[PDB]
Amino acid sequence: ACYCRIPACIAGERRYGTCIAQGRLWAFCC
């Protein structure tokens, strides 16, 4: 699955983008 993550993507994932949610920045990871 793909995830918006803080503080960074997990091993095995790539950061394909950014999420803005709950007034915060996240890495978009899949």
Side-chain angles (χ1 to χ4, degrees):
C2 308
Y3 291 87
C4 292
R5 298 194 187 279
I6 286 168
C9 301
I10 292 162
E13 296 179 335
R14 297 308 155 125
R15 183 170 177 184
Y16 288 106
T18 304
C19 326
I20 299 174
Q22 303 294 260
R24 300 161 73 184
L25 289 159
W26 314 65
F28 180 59
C29 304
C30 209

